[PDB]
Every structure is written in structure tokens, then in C-alpha cells.
């Protein structure tokens, strides 16, 4: 899960909502980057390939 | 002809040195070629110290100093009269001038 991840790591096939089995960053040579966390009201900022 | 033995540069033993920005016209010159002056002065001019002194709330007070380091290109150095032309024999004398210690 994206919470158990430090900032700055690249991942792939990220779920828009928990349980939909992959929506984002699933093309050859692409990825997404985590930016920061909000431990309260848990939500994470990410950066998409388009910017 | 060579006008100066050191080429007026003071750079021997190395190939390059990073330049700096002139403090007046913002020109680029090598750091070793610029004329550098270090100045220590008071925050206020000597006539104004009394007015600040008796308006303070700390009994005796000492106004702080200000420290600056100005550095010029040669073209702006002798137009502002920081340095001036010397004679042929007097050129080769690098001792700092003797500041007046009696003031008449």
C-alpha cells in the first residue's frame, strides 16, 4: 500500500481508489512519484507522467 | 613594452581565476585584478550621536558599526579618485600610504 512508502520512490499501476486494480502509470517506461503524506485524514500527493 | 612587471594583475602560478562583479558599473573583472577597499564606519554620522545617545532607554549606549567591502574595476577606480596616476619611478611602490595620525 502507498502509505508504507517513503517519499521520492517511483511506483507503477497505482489504484485511483483502493480496490479497483490499477489505473495510473502502466505504459512502457512510465511511473509515478510520491511527494508527501498527510498522516491525519490519510491522503497522499502524487505526480503523474503528464506533470 | 611592458608597463608593469606583474602585468598589473597579481596572478602567477595558476591558469584561471573566477571573475567578480564591479560594485559600481557591474562589470566583470578577475578577482585578483580588482581594487578592494575594506571600510568600518558607524551607523550614524558623528554629529547625530548625541541626539541618539540621550534619547536611548539603556543609560549609556554604543551605536553599532557597519562593515563593507567595496571592489571596483580600474576604469571606475580612477574616476572616483580611489587611486590616481603615479610617476614612472613611483609606480613600483606597494606600501600602503601613511594615514595622517596628527591631523594638524
Amino acid at each position: 500500500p502507498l502509505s508504507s512508502v517513503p517519499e521520492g520512490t517511483v511506483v507503477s499501476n497505482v489504484e485511483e481508489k483502493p480496490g479497483d486494480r490499477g489505473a495510473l502509470g502502466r505504459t512502457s517506461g512510465n511511473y509515478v512519484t510520491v511527494v508527501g503524506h498527510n498522516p491525519d485524514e490519510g491522503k497522499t500527493r502524487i505526480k503523474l507522467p503528464s506533470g | 613594452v611592458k608597463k608593469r612587471k606583474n602585468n598589473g594583475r597579481n596572478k602567477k602560478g595558476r591558469g584561471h581565476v573566477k571573475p567578480i562583479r564591479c560594485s559600481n558599473c557591474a562589470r566583470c573583472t578577475p578577482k585578483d585584478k580588482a581594487i578592494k577597499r575594506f571600510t568600518i564606519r558607524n551607523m550614524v554620522e558623528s554629529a547625530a550621536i548625541r541626539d541618539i545617545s540621550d534619547a536611548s532607554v539603556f543609560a549609556e549606549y554604543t551605536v553599532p558599526k557597519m562593515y563593507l567591502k567595496l571592489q571596483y574595476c580600474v576604469s571606475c577606480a580612477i574616476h572616483g579618485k580611489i587611486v590616481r596616476v603615479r610617476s614612472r619611478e613611483g609606480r613600483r611602490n606597494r606600501a600602503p600610504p601613511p594615514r595622517v595620525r596628527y591631523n594638524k
Partner: protein, 232 residues
């Protein structure tokens, strides 16, 4: 200049009606934490509390610059200034705690001089209370009374030895402390005098100081802890 406005209020505008906004302001007193001597440090201004705009919300993220000389009633600490951040607002009173430290600008420029060596280092540290704060250190070479040589320069190998010693001392002292405990060590400059003794063998190293301290993270508010130091 009176006669330069051309567009003035802009595309289309009209004059105002109500003025003098100072009729609705209020004054509050500011307090200081436990270790410092004097508690009153001045007054502050804010709009009066009203519907849709609470006053306490505007007095919970302010910081103040107070010279350490005023807090300790001593002119020795006339070159260090520290910040106090407001947290809770009692009746016509603001409560504050530590938020940093810094030298005055003129003291730092007077220390640096030509024909000397400047050594500087930094290191992050966390306390038993989960505070993430960073410390800076500074020192200069010391001349010898019978010295004839013009310049006192240290070798770069010796500089790295001193820099390594600086980091070890700072970590050891701040390893097991609280924020209140650490502040009580900053004002008598315990860190500086201990660093000078340890580095004596490598080089004399006059003028040991902690240049500045700034904090990066804070734990939960924990109102019980704030009242412990205040209202003594």
C-alpha cells in the same frame, strides 16, 4: 508626488465611506517560557473578536523577535536574538515557547577577519520529545602571545579533524534531553566551552559559538506540557 496619478482608482471606481479602522482593535499582553527571567515582553494588536471571525484564530501563529539581553536582564547576551511562538490565549494573555535562535548581524561580521581560518559545521538532532531541530557551529583560529609569524592558518587535514569533533560533541549533548532542558544549556553556552576543551590538542581554536538553531518538526500540541512551564 501629488500630480502624477493618471489612472488613479482604475477603470471605474468611487470613494470610500468608513475610515479609521483602529477603533476596533484590542491589545494583549505577551508572556515568556519558564527558563527566562522576565516574562512580560510587550504588547500586540489585533481586530476585536466578532461573529464569523474569532480573535484567537489570528493569535496562534505569530512569532516575536526578543533580544536575549531583555529576557535575562543582562547586557552580556546583547548579540543573540530568539523567537517566541504563541500557542494558547488565556484572558488577555498570550503564551509562547521556544522557536529558534540567531546572532545579530553586526556581531558575526566583526568575528570574521583576514589571515585566520574559519571552521563551520552543522548537524540535525532529535530530542526525547520528538522535536526535529538543527544546530550550527562556528569557530576561528587563535593567535599565540609570543607569535611572530603574520598568519595563523590550520591545515585542511586538521580542519576535518575539528569538524568531526564538533559533530560528535553536539550529538552527545543533545542525545538525551528535552526542549526545556536543551534551552537551559544554550544560554550559558555550555556547548561552546566543552568543544574548546576537547579540540585543544588539535589546535587552540578561539571563539567557539553556536551560530543559530531552527526546528523542523513538532509533536502533538499537548496542552498539559505548555502550562507546566508557564504560570509559575
Amino acid at each position: 508626488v501629488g500630480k502624477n496619478k493618471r489612472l488613479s482608482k482604475g477603470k471605474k471606481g468611487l470613494k470610500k465611506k468608513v475610515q479609521d479602522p483602529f477603533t476596533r482593535k484590542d491589545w494583549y499582553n505577551i508572556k515568556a517560557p519558564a527558563p527566562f527571567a522576565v516574562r512580560d515582553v510587550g504588547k500586540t494588536l489585533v481586530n476585536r473578536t466578532t461573529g464569523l471571525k474569532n480573535a484567537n484564530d489570528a493569535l496562534k501563529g505569530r512569532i516575536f523577535e526578543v533580544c536575549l539581553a531583555d529576557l535575562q536582564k543582562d547586557e552580556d547576551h546583547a548579540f543573540r536574538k530568539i523567537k517566541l511562538r504563541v500557542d494558547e490565549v488565556q484572558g488577555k494573555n498570550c503564551l509562547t515557547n521556544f522557536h529558534g535562535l540567531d546572532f545579530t548581524t553586526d556581531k558575526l561580521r566583526s568575528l570574521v577577519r583576514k589571515w585566520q581560518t574559519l571552521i563551520e559545521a552543522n548537524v540535525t538532532v532529535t530530542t526525547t520529545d520528538h522535536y526535529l531541530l538543527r544546530l550550527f557551529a562556528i569557530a576561528f583560529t587563535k593567535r599565540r602571545p609570543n607569535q611572530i609569524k603574520k598568519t595563523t592558518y590550520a591545515q585542511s587535514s586538521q580542519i576535518r579533524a575539528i569538524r568531526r569533533k564538533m559533530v560528535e560533541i553536539i550529538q552527545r549533548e543533545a542525545a538525551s534531553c528535552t526542549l526545556h532542558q536543551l534551552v537551559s544549556k544554550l544560554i550559558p553556552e555550555v556547548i561552546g566551552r566543552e568543544i574548546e576543551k576537547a579540540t585543544q590538542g588539535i589546535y587552540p581554536l578561539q571563539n567557539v559559538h553556536i551560530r543559530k538553531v531552527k526546528l523542523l518538526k513538532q509533536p502533538k500540541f499537548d496542552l498539559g506540557a505548555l502550562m507546566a512551564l508557564h504560570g509559575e
